[PDB]
Amino acid sequence: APVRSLNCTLRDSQQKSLVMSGPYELKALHLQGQDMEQQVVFSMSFVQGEESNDKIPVALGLKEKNLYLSCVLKDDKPTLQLESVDPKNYPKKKMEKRFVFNKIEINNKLEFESAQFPNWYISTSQAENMPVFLGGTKGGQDITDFTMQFV
Amino acid sequence: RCDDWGLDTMRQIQVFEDEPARIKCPLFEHFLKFNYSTAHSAGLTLIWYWTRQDRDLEEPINFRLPENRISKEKDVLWFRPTLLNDTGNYTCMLRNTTYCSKVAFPLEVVQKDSCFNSPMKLPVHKLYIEYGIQRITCPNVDGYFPSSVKPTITWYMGCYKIQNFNNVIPEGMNLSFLIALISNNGNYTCVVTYPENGRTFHLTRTLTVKVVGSPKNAVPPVIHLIPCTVYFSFLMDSRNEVWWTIDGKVTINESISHSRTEDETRTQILYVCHARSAKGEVAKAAK
Amino acid sequence: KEREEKIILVSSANEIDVRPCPLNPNEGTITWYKDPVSTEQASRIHQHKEKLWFVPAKVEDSGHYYCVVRNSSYCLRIKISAKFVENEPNLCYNAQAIFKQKLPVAGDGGLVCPYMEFFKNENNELPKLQWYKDCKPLLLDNIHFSGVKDRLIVMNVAEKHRGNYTCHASYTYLGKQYPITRVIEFITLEENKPTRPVIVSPANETMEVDLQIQLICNVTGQLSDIAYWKWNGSVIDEDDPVLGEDYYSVENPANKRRSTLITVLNISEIESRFYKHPFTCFAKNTHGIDAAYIQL
Ligand SMILES: *[C@@H]1O[C@H](CO)[C@@H](O)[C@H](O)[C@H]1NC(C)=O
Ligand SMILES: *[C@@H]1O[C@H](CO)[C@@H](O)[C@H](O)[C@H]1NC(C)=O
Ligand SMILES: *[C@@H]1O[C@H](CO)[C@@H](O)[C@H](O)[C@H]1NC(C)=O
Ligand SMILES: *[C@@H]1O[C@H](CO)[C@@H](O)[C@H](O)[C@H]1NC(C)=O
Ligand SMILES: *[C@@H]1O[C@H](CO)[C@@H](O)[C@H](O)[C@H]1NC(C)=O
Ligand SMILES: *[C@@H]1O[C@H](CO)[C@@H](O)[C@H](O)[C@H]1NC(C)=O
Ligand SMILES: *[C@@H]1O[C@H](CO)[C@@H](O)[C@H](O)[C@H]1NC(C)=O
Incomplete structure (x- = not known):
């Protein structure tokens, strides 16, 4: 086993869950108990990236959709997308920079910093049924802080 | 022959240009056990002077400047507003013919960016992580205007006005943090602006917030x-x-x-x- | 035409609701249809701005309705479904309206009253929210509970806090006041904690010299922690034929934050370099780092 994965569910700090909304796009919203099965189950692959004093390099793939979250430019602006892949090739161990995030996880509160674009983070909006994106601000209008639950 | 208490550095008295600043004579109730009213009744007089920065000559403060700019009022020294060249150390002294106690405080006037940058050493208000609601208060605001006048207080994070934040609520003079997280680290600025006699003033304080370990x-x-x-x-x-x-x-x-x-x-x-x-x-x- | 928003947002009968067009922010001009919707607010179901207002909603409404942005150039549009529900018997809510939320004991945390973003006043401020637990009202005393905006800040969670909560508002549409109800199931979790992984073995020690051997990293910590090897001040590569790393993880039923992490430095064939620089195991998270070696 060249890298270890674990299968987790994600929520933001305002308790919104991530569901997949029509493909190539995750949206965050609040869910009722009878639709908890609609949560995007993630696979957190603990890849290799830059040694940091206190961050942990991880790649975020969806589970048997063969999609991985990715960070690229788009009109010269860092943007978050789902790249499709061949599962015989991934989960690699040295993943390309657009796949790797730096996990900051403090008292089980996670935020993932893009390794490609430093000081950019997986953000959700305070609003409902609104797609996950990538932000340039912590502590402001957007939520950058997440909770993890296991499978 | 004075009691020279020296220079009181328990100011945080660097101050932005074009803003008001009142300083209370540090003697009272600190260096001395009594207030201004008592000492006056005890036949003490209170006097003021300063040394300019890059200077050794103790000059008088000028109280006859345009618009009564630098003013004195009991134990308070008023700059309305401060100018760059006010920077230096100010001495208040209380003297009798048989009594003499003095101290001085540093005044460093400082310039501002459009987004609150300055050589100002910011103060640090640490916040407990995940600790219910915690509040910061806009510092050094009392004394600048009466309760009779209601000012505008605008809160900022970085260069940005705080409006519709996730876990941050501006409540007037108080900024509220809901269950702080390390995402909440940074510089926060309060701009309180008020009317004084048909001029408007502005008071600006910026501070570093650091989220730390819970009790x-x-x-x-x-x-x-x-x-x-x-x-x-x-x-x-x-x-x-x-x-x-x-x-x-x-x-x-x-x-x-x-x-x-x-x-x-x-x-x-x-x-x-x-x-x-x-x-x-x-x-x-x-x- | 159609693509379906197949997620059935259930809201409360006899009480006002608002549904928006579920578009990624690339939106246009929105028209609402039943299985169109009235345009004048007086009609108990209508369009105002680009949302479908139910003023109030009755149960008979449950069904599918449509929203359609059209540009002449493009006009493919979206169908959404609604279920309205009267409260269960002897209950101020209904089971399939409940949003599940969770929080960790021994911490402070807050619930959130969902789908309230539309009921704001002109300053974009919402109505004072009243909080309930199992149809009994709460003391917002700022010791145990606090309500700001849509939050119910709860302090010192303990399992006694486990219940169905209710956030309630009053909306004024058109000079008649309207009540808004949401339900949250509060379910506690295991306490959050500052925990740094801690290394079990290797234990800063010598080992006698060979010339396909394995070399074990045992770390006690969380599953979100990591444990890896570095040698000669650099990391094990995927293209280093002698040196392999395989990462395993044994959970712990007892204390999931104190559960074994296992990494194996599969060296296979020794080389003379390996006696000259020690092999260091690193265990690391956001809280702290540990280090241990074995020299060959
Ligand atoms: C100090 O000044 C105050 C006026 O603010 C006065 O009430 C008091 O009698 C004076 N001395 C004290 C501390 O008793
Ligand atoms: C001088 O000040 C001292 C100290 O307060 C006081 O004892 C004395 O009465 C004062 N003398 C006069 C004339 O003010
Ligand atoms: C004030 O005087 C002190 C000496 O006591 C000097 O070191 C310092 O540079 C002065 N500061 C200002 C604000 O002029
Ligand atoms: C203001 O905050 C920033 C981070 O946003 C920090 O890097 C900087 O040190 C602070 N300013 C000063 C002068 O301390
Ligand atoms: C909330 O109510 C539902 C249905 O009445 C019930 O199944 C559930 O146990 C309740 N949750 C709690 C923890 O009170
Ligand atoms: C060390 O890890 C092994 C599995 O590699 C496990 O059996 C053992 O219990 C761990 N150490 C301790 C002291 O539990
Ligand atoms: C083991 O070695 C590491 C350096 O490789 C050192 O930092 C650590 O303190 C050592 N463990 C102990 C407690 O001897």
């Missing part, structure tokens, strides 16, 4: 060529110590490490290793 995780010290490694959970006013004994006291190398939540990690090298925090003193032996 509910604060704990006595945890122990791990001989390394004595100790982990000190963050506690607010705590003297973290570490020492080897042999029975009483070869080289050594201390090494403080800190974390995002300011939890300390003192590693120290080389038979018993000790550690003392405000919550404990422990010791562990070596093989």
